[PDB]
């Protein structure tokens, strides 16, 4: 067990990392379905590499590799949607955003590094259940943390791993750099709490609306950084139909799995969205969600960067298909 892990590092820290072109990770329309585990890790390395993070922060191939692997093994396999392939698909979206969407040219190297590390670990040790549930079931994690419970935990984990020996991919940073990187990373991961996205997006939607929004502003920026996290965290909804189709199948199951617990240990009725029996009201529930949470946001993101439009396009394109379905 420890053995398969350790050879995994041997084989990984010695394979050639293919180009970004080869890996089609520059694409908003990208899919992981056909990649192996080892391949995904490789992409990740290519990500760090092509963002100049590797060179500008004196990362040793050895270390990065260990770290990456560590994150991989700290996502739960038994968990339907919120496994490693989610953290990975998010980071790739994030990567695609900075490159093809052209945002890199809009922010610092400290920020880029933080976003990537955050994107990768924003859901660590997610146990396939929402903040709402853990709160209502008096999980000890709820006793520990106040608000954004899970997201606080995801970070507690991220940080535990970065402090692990031979995982200090940050070891190269000045203490001041390190110190503020971590700050941003904390902000990023917490931002993936849907509740904060909601309690904050209004502000941001207006600066856009009023043609006032401007990156230069320190605060305006860090808000946007939150919004960007959300944007990638659920980028799945902006995928080609056949993909969106299938990934919506996982979210489906994971929800329904929680729904079961709600009436088996909690003895409450689950929301329809997690009510396994109501599987036939999926598509409208999808529609309402896309309307409520998504289009709104990806629109904004394009006003900020035009080259980010494919996200908006793919989003409404799926909304189209769910709506049809909802009408059988």
């Amino acid at each position: 067990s420890h053995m398969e892990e350790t050879r995994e590092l041997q084989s990984l820290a010695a394979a050639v990392v293919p180009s970004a072109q080869t890996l089609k990770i520059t694409d908003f329309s990208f899919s992981d379905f056909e990649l192996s585990d080892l391949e995904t890790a490789l992409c990740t390395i290519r990500m760090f590499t092509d963002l100049n993070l590797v060179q500008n922060f004196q990362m040793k191939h050895e270390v990065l590799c260990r770290w990456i692997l560590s994150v991989k093994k700290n996502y739960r396999k038994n968990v339907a949607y919120h496994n490693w392939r989610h953290a990975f698909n998010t980071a790739q979206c994030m990567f695609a955003a900075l490159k093809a969407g052209k945002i890199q040219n809009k922010l610092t190297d400290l920020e880029i590094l933080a976003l990537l590390i955050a994107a990768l670990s924003h859901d660590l040790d997610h146990r396939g259940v929402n903040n709402s549930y853990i709160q209502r079931s008096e999980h000890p994690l709820a006793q520990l943390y106040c608000h954004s419970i899970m997201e606080h935990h995801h970070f507690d984990q991220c940080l535990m791993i970065l402090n692990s020996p031979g995982n200090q991919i940050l070891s190269g940073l000045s203490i001041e750099e390190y110190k503020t990187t971590l700050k941003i990373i904390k902000q990023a991961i917490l931002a993936t709490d849907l509740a904060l996205y909601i309690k904050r997006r209004g502000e941001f939607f207006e600066l856009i609306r009023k043609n006032q929004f401007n990156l230069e502003d320190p605060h305006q920026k860090e808000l946007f950084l939150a919004m960007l996290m959300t944007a990638c965290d659920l980028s799945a909804i902006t995928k080609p139909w056949p993909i969106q189709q299938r990934i919506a199948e996982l979210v489906a199951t994971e929800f329904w799995e929680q729904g079961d617990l709600e009436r088996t240990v909690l003895q409450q009725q689950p929301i329809p969205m997690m009510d396994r029996n109501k599987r036939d009201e999926l598509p409208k529930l999808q529609v309402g969600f896309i309307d409520f949470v998504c289009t709104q946001l990806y629109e904004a993101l394009t006003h900020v960067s035009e080259d980010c439009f494919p996200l908006l396009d793919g989003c409404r394109k799926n909304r189209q298909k769910w709506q049809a379905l909802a009408e059988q």
């Binding site: 709402s132 509740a195 929301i271 969205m273 309402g288 969600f289 409520f292």
Partner: peptide
């Protein structure tokens, strides 16, 4: 997690709050 009471239904019927 305190929001406007009109919002509350939509918020909950999706996995939020």
């Amino acid at each position: 997690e305190a929001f406007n009471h009109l919002e509350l239904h939509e918020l909950a019927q999706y996995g939020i709050i």
